[PDB]
Amino acid sequence: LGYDKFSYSWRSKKGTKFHQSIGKHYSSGYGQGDVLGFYINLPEDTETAKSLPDTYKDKALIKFKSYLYFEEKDFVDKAEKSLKQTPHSEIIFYKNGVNQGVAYKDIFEGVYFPAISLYKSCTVSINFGPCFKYPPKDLTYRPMSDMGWGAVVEHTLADVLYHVETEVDGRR
């Protein structure tokens, strides 16, 4: 985390900020029983660039042995060269409200995924959403594990969701 501009990190040990294999002694460390707050400060609408693939043959569909798999793959050397900056470009590594300061700035312009980076065997619990502290604001992270007709209709909806493009595409 931080090795590339795509990823941003704040080290848990000694609080030494690290990015692109470059380290500066910046803050204090964290760890056991330390809840890391995270509120990416973009309450206002922004603009980013999402998709720009460079390969196509690796994006194919064929039976493996008894089931299909969707080869939806990313690339690297092309994606890194489309790197751009965007609004609210700051991945701040809070400490549950209290913040030591954003370690690194000028984050990559694109869809944001909160990455949790581990280095050895260690467990960690999560709570993400458009809320503040309590997980149950929206539907409490439904797993969609039920036998009723709701599962049937949602599965058929997803089937159609991909069926539209598998019909309008045209298979080689």
Partner 1 sequence: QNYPEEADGTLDCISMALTCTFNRWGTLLAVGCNDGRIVIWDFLTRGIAKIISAHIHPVCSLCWSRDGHKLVSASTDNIVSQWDVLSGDCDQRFRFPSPILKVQYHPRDQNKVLVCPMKSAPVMLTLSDSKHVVLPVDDDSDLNVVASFDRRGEYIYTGNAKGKILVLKTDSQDLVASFRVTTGTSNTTAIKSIEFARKGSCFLINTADRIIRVYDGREILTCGRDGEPEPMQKLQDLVNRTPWKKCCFSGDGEYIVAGSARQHALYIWEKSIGNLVKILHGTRGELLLDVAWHPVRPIIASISSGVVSIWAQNQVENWSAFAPDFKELDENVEYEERESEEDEEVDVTSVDEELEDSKALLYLPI
**Total number of residues that touch partner 1 (CB under 8 A):** 8
**For 153-162, which contacts have Cβ atoms below 8 Å and span 24 or more sequence positions?**
none
Residue with smaller CB distance to partner 1, 22 or 35: 22
Please say whether the beta carbons of 91 and 104 come within 8 A: yes
As to burial, measured by CB atoms within 10 angstroms (0-12 exposed, 13-18 middle, 19+ buried), residue 93 is buried
- Rounded to the nearest whole angstrom, what is the least distance from the CB of residue 108 to partner 1 in the complex? 22
CB of 23 to partner 1, least distance (A): 6
Q: Smallest distance, Å, CB 149 to partner 1?
A: 46
- In angstroms, give the least distance from the CB of 17 to partner 1: 12
Torsion angles phi and psi, residue 132, rounded to 5: -110, -60
21 binds partner 1 (CB under 8 A): yes
Piece of 17-25, 93-101, 102-110, 142-150 that binds partner 1 (CB under 8 A): 17-25
* Burial state string for 115-151 with b = 16 or more CB within 10 A and e = fewer than 16: eeeeeeeeeeeeeeeeeeeeeeeeeeeeeeeeeeeee
Q: Provide the CB-side half-sphere exposure for 159 (13 A, CA).
A: 6
Q: Which is nearer to partner 1, 25 or 65 (CB)?
A: 25
Do residues 49 and 82 make contact, with C-beta atoms less than 8 angstroms apart? Answer: yes
> For residues 70 and 58, is the Cβ–Cβ distance under 8 A?
no
Fill in the per-residue mask, 69 to 108: x = in contact with partner 1 (CB under 8 A), - = not in contact.
----------------------------------------
Residue 6 and residue 20 in contact, taking contact as beta carbons nearer than 8 Å: no
Closer residue to partner 1, CB minimum distance, 18 or 112: 18
Stretch 112-131 residues interacting with partner 1 (CB under 8 A): 119-120
User: Considering only residues 1, 5, 6, 16, which one is a binding residue for partner 1 as defined by CB under 8 A?
Assistant: 16
Q: Which positions touch partner 1 (CB under 8 A)?
A: 13-14, 16, 18, 21, 23, 119-120
